[model samples]
Target chain A: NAADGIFFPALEQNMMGAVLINENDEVMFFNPAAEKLWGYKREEVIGNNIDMLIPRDLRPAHPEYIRHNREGGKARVEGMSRELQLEKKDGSKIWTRFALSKVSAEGKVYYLALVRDAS
Target chain B: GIFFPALEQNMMGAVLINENDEVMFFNPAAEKLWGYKREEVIGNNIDMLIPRDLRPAHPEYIRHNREGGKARVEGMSRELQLEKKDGSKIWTRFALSKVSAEGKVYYLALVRDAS
Candidate 1:
């Protein structure tokens, strides 16, 4: 109760962009900061695979991520922050600082990304 | 296709701690940030990187987490002054994620230099 109260409100007002995806890589949450960064409306990306947010060149990486998990690879990316070029809805690209984490709760796995404009 | 190629080559620092507050995973970026090799930090209490005065609340946080605290949202990054192996302190921005798997709870931190 306390967690959601603080977490959701803070997350909603956070200056940094945030995205959450389930084990299937389907988007579950996309905050306003994310909407600003990607130029996509909240409804557009919510149910889509996170792959839609990646540039064509980077799309291949998503499948590999899935395959890796399928093959017993560790969630090695859980604590990494990196600079990435993200493709926005208008087919434009922007540089952003991105961090990813693996969250397993209630016996299910999810990935959360924190992004900030770096361009 | 390789496994999460971009993630495999990620440059951000990450740390994973178990329910006991023992460091379970520490990465290269983390080594650089804390100035301690993984060997010296793994299996050690996460307090090694936390200030002594702040140590007491660390366990309390873990207790709350295992008791059913949700993952910390990263909508806004928190700036923390963390101690490095050299006993120096660095202020960094980070996010905390609570993970529960196999009946155990773990804490994952995604950290970056604070600009």
Candidate 2:
């Protein structure tokens, strides 16, 4: 399990933050870069909703968006990379660019979000 | 490896198409602008994004890139309308860059919705 721990830790510290979320919208893995960007440790966000890092205004529609995608519906943001802001743990808003993709893991579908800190 | 970061935090639509006219990628921003999932566009012809009236002239523009060493859209940005999945339209500022790999060529287009 040592490699699992070490390798994963390294994976999270890439130049950009990589956040892995499961079908339930729970934070499956909060990479170190994301940890640093959001001021949360891996343990803190693990199993928590990905909404914690999103702006409060955007949280409500998060679930609906996922469900729509699950149903094979179209979304405006699915293929475009654009500007968006997120709330950091410190209550300050940080602008970050993110690109999310649909992927399957362990036979379960997960949304992989690559977050790059704009600051 | 180093990567560009100027728009790293911004939602900039990016697309990649191979010389064969197959759509290789449709970034998140593109999906939002075009109202199509990334999957729906990838592996399909890029012309699907153009309006029916523009499809014919589109191939000639692409062919010019293959023959000419210059990318007219590269380094400079311009505004134009692209059809969305619902047969609607959204205007965007689009640009293109050319790169080659394994003896084949690819065109990378960057776009941002203008409206």
Candidate 3:
């Protein structure tokens, strides 16, 4: 039912890559756009830390990002959208807009990120 | 209008959708927002802007609202994560309202850039 309600539509729309990440940043859901963007299939990436999507150099900084936001830091990108460099499959880097938010369903909190390819 | 000035200043993209989810008007800001010309979207289904998966149930959602259904947000203002034309997704905070004029029902939506 969750698939029919949420995941199916997200994948069909070619919307930003939708991925469900737990508090530990482990990926739960990775849609087609995410697969195309990262060159990793669903099975290959599920259960992996979302940090896997970040470039190697930036991976180390992710914890600080979560920490800052957790300590009552407002979302820096929510209102003022920004463009950042992201790595893709084949080891190539591309520009993308990263939007992060939290979604709660069935008493579980999941991190929702919308990823847009920057043109 | 609060949104007109911002749209005119090229600071926002605005589109008005009728109760039937048809596009009534699209501003230049809307054009730039979706990368489609006015001619391409005007008079088209608002669902064109929605990704394939979300569209099927959209009409149902609209129908439910017509029957006095309540939305997840007051004034139907909520942040929806949606897909854009380039196969990318963006977050938009949308405000919706229902108005009756001469016994006809219509919906007005003001979309603001979120993320």
Candidate 4:
């Protein structure tokens, strides 16, 4: 269900944030909770790069990590729920915990991330 | 690649079932919520968690989903009573997701305490 009509209505309304990014790291799906978490509307963030959520200093290193995993390097944090900070749409930061999942569909790869408030 | 990421401290409970309705992934949070050992639950049919009255029709429901049947619960979250390991039931807010990979189907559930 790689965007060709794969629907996850429950996730769209989940209390926790859920996001799906394509192999290119482009935001393909952004649910309502994700909108609330980062203060960006679904339309505002969809189709954008994941870098928009990374702090400026961290932006430079984000893509390399994705590239590393895509090129067959061991996944550095594939299954860890690590505490991290995200740059919100307002240019402010919020601390949160999140888990990342790599899902393959129809021979394409996607990353599904679930996030929650650290507090 | 099918294994879910590690979420030792995750607060949200999660479960994954394959096309056959067999439990695939049950997280630590799920263990806390359902009161079952991961070892005891994995590879079992998802029936262990559904309340008895609802158990009979679940397979048909999953069959409907995999055979291109209408998705009544795919994108919806609902309040339901799920059976725990000790045969006790508790209310929960449950969400279901259907996943497709390598031409196969899987279902993932996200559960939260509703009581």
Q: Which has the greatest TM-score?
A: 1
Which of the predicted structures, 3 or 4, would earn the higher DockQ when compared with the native? 4
For model 3, residues B6-75, the per-residue Cα lDDT tens digits are 2222223446556566776666656655667778887888888766778787787777777874422244
Interface RMSD of 2: 13.0
lDDT at A19, model 4: 81
Q: How well is candidate 2 docked (DockQ)?
A: 0.04
Looking at candidate 1 chain B, the ten consecutive residues that score lowest on lDDT are B1-10
Candidate 4 runs further than 4 Å off: A1-7, A73-78, B1-13, B16-115
TM-score of chain A, all candidates: 0.87, 0.80, 0.78, 0.85
lDDT of 1 by residue, A9-72 (tens): 3344445677877777888878788999999989999989878888888887778865576456
Question: For candidate 1, lDDT tens digit of each residue in B1-115?
Answer: 1112222233556676776888877767788888989899899888887766687777675675566555544432458887886777888877666654435666667567884
Deviation in angstroms for A40 in model 2?
A: 1.4
Off by over 4 Å in 1: A1-4, A73-77, B1-87, B91-115
lDDT of 3 at B60: 77
> Per-prediction DockQ scores?
0.07, 0.04, 0.05, 0.09
Choose 1 or 3, whichever is better by lDDT. 1
lDDT of 3 by residue, A1-119 (tens): 43332223322233356566665668877877678777888898888877777788888887787656545534322223357888875888888766555443444445656565666
lDDT of 2 by residue, A58-106 (tens): 8898778777777773432233455688787788888876666565445
Cα deviation at A34, candidate 1, in Å, is 0.2
